[PDB]
Paper text:
Here we applied protein engineering technology to target virus-encoded deubiquitinating enzymes of two viruses with significant impact on human health: Middle East respiratory syndrome coronavirus (MERS-CoV) and Crimean-Congo hemorrhagic fever virus (CCHFV). This resulted in the rapid identification of ubiquitin variant (UbV) inhibitors that bound with high affinity and specificity to the viral deubiquitinating enzymes.
Both UbVs bound in nearly identical orientations as Ub.wt with interface surface areas of ~1000 Å2. Substitutions common to both ME.4 and ME.2 at positions 46, 64 and 70 were found to promote more favorable hydrophobic interactions with the enzyme relative to Ub.wt. UbV residue Phe46 inserts into a hydrophobic pocket formed by PLpro residues Trp1668*, Glu1670*, Val1680*, Leu1682*, Tyr1690* and Tyr1705*, and forms a cation-π interaction with Arg1715*. The UbVs also differ in their C-terminal residues at positions 74, 75 and 77. In ME.4, Asn74 extends into the active site and forms a hydrogen bonding network with Asp1645* and Gly1758*, which mimics hydrogen bonds formed by the same region of MERS-CoV PLpro with Ub.wt residues Arg74, Gly75 and Gly76. In ME.2, Pro74 cannot form an analogous hydrogen bonding network, which likely contributes to the decreased inhibitory potency of ME.2 compared to ME.4. Instead, Pro74 and the C-terminal tail are excluded from the active site and the main-chains interact through a hydrogen bond formed between the main-chain amide nitrogen of Arg75 and the backbone carbonyl of Glu1754*. A structural comparison of the C-terminal regions of ME.2 and ME.4 near the PLpro active site is shown in S4 Fig. Additional substitutions in the N-terminal region of ME.4 and ME.2 (region 1) do not make favourable contacts with MERS-CoV PLpro, and in fact, residues 8–10 and 7–10 of ME.4 and ME.2, respectively, failed to resolve in electron density maps.
Numbering used by the authors:
A (entry chain B): 1 to 6, 11 to 75
B (entry chain A): 1481 to 1800
Write the structure that this text describes.
């Protein structure tokens, strides 16, 4: 499964991956620390404990990225 | 030995277990990280004066104490209990003022972001936390003792004492462990020219909060993204019943004025530079002026150019 993270990058992911697992693969790409990562999907802030299945993250879903303030 | 004491140990204040200790080693070596009357006494030698009192344990939990830990706090990280106890002691130095029956957190150790979070949570009607420790600390907060709730949300939000943090991040992290006690719905009409039209429905607390927009007009605006088939997919709000709407966005400059009588009831403000340390201010719209609750201090102005982050709107009644 491929998803997109907002500039826009694309990640190869599985529906069982947690949000912390997604933030981990973002740090390997963009270098942003996972603590400073805010992932938004459908206006809902994603919690590290939950998986992409809980938020119904499907194919070609777009996750918005906001930095923790202060940046 | 020399002296033997029997203390009671708890992780939830309800269930206890007796531990026989010595005066030949510290609490940490015999029992672990323990707090007594809100103080880390782990590296002290047990005294006979502290015989039959209760200790709050932070590590070296038994099998049943981890079960009691999860039933009270939920699946927490291994450092949660030690951070929560440490935060609860440092927050005790803070002060919660109540000016005209609305609570505000005095400025201390860059806690202005906690002021915006707390003062916004006070306005959210019919909310209740699904975690017992959060709900217990929330009731004590609404009763006049907020140190438990302040330290808890800092522990769940992984906040460091004395360091500035994100008020919008913590506000939604806290709301993620809450539910709404009244009916609330929002219906997004999705459609792709290939697959077709499909409705999705969010009910409860998720139908009252959105991160990305800061005005209602931006919420019902048509949105475009990529469908599962790989084609263009659209989305638009077509039904919205709610008791209140919390719209959060990045700090955005806006001229909040009492000339047009805005429809929202409260909003948060981020003052300063984003890359540098900034100051959060909570604001409410009482009467016909803006009430800026700036961490214990109160101000009033008819107009204000500010970088708005969160906005709180009244009940929604919308359909199309
Ligand atoms: Cl945690
Ligand atoms: Cl209040
Ligand atoms: Cl306090
Ligand atoms: Cl169609
Ligand atoms: Zn399609």
């Amino acid at each position: 499964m491929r998803i997109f993270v907002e500039l826009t990058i694309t990640l190869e992911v599985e529906p069982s991956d947690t949000i912390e697992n997604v933030k981990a693969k973002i740090q390997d790409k963009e270098g942003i620390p996972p603590d400073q990562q805010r992932l938004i999907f459908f206006g809902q802030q994603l919690e590290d404990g939950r998986t992409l299945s809980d938020y119904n993250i499907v194919k070609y879903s777009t996750l918005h990225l906001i930095l923790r303030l202060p940046r | 030995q020399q002296l033997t004491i029997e203390v009671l140990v708890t992780v939830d204040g309800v269930n206890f277990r007796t531990v026989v200790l010595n005066n030949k080693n510290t609490y940490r070596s015999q029992l672990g990280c323990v707090f007594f009357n809100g103080a880390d006494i782990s590296d002290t030698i047990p005294d006979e004066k502290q015989n039959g009192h209760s200790l709050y344990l932070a590590d070296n939990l038994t099998a049943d104490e981890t079960k009691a830990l999860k039933e009270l706090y939920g699946p927490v990280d291994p450092t949660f209990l030690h951070r929560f106890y440490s935060l609860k002691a440092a927050v005790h130095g803070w002060k919660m003022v109540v000016c005209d029956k609305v609570r505000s957190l005095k400025l201390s150790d860059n806690n202005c972001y906690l002021n915006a979070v707390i003062m916004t949570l006070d306005l959210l009607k019919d909310i209740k936390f699904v975690i017992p420790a959060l709900q217990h600390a929330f009731m004590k907060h609404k009763g006049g003792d907020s140190t438990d709730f302040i330290a808890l949300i800092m522990a769940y939000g992984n906040c460091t004492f004395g360091a500035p943090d994100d008020a919008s991040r913590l506000l939604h992290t806290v709301l993620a462990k809450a539910e709404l006690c009244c009916s609330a719905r929002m219906v997004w009409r999705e459609w792709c020219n290939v697959c077709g039209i499909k409705d999705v429905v969010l009910q409860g607390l998720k139908a009252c909060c959105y991160v990305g927009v800061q005005t209602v007009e931006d919420l019902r605006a048509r949105m475009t993204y990529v469908c599962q088939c790989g084609g263009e997919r659209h989305r638009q709000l077509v039904e919205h019943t709610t008791p209140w709407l919390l719209l959060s966005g990045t700090p955005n400059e806006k001229l909040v004025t009492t000339s047009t009588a805005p429809d929202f009831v409260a909003f948060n403000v981020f003052q300063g530079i984003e890359t540098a340390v900034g100051h959060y201010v909570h604001a409410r719209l009482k009467g016909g002026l803006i009430l800026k609750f700036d961490s214990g201090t109160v101000s009033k102005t008819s107009d204000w150019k500010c970088k708005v982050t969160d906005v709180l709107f009244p009940g929604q009644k919308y359909s199309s």
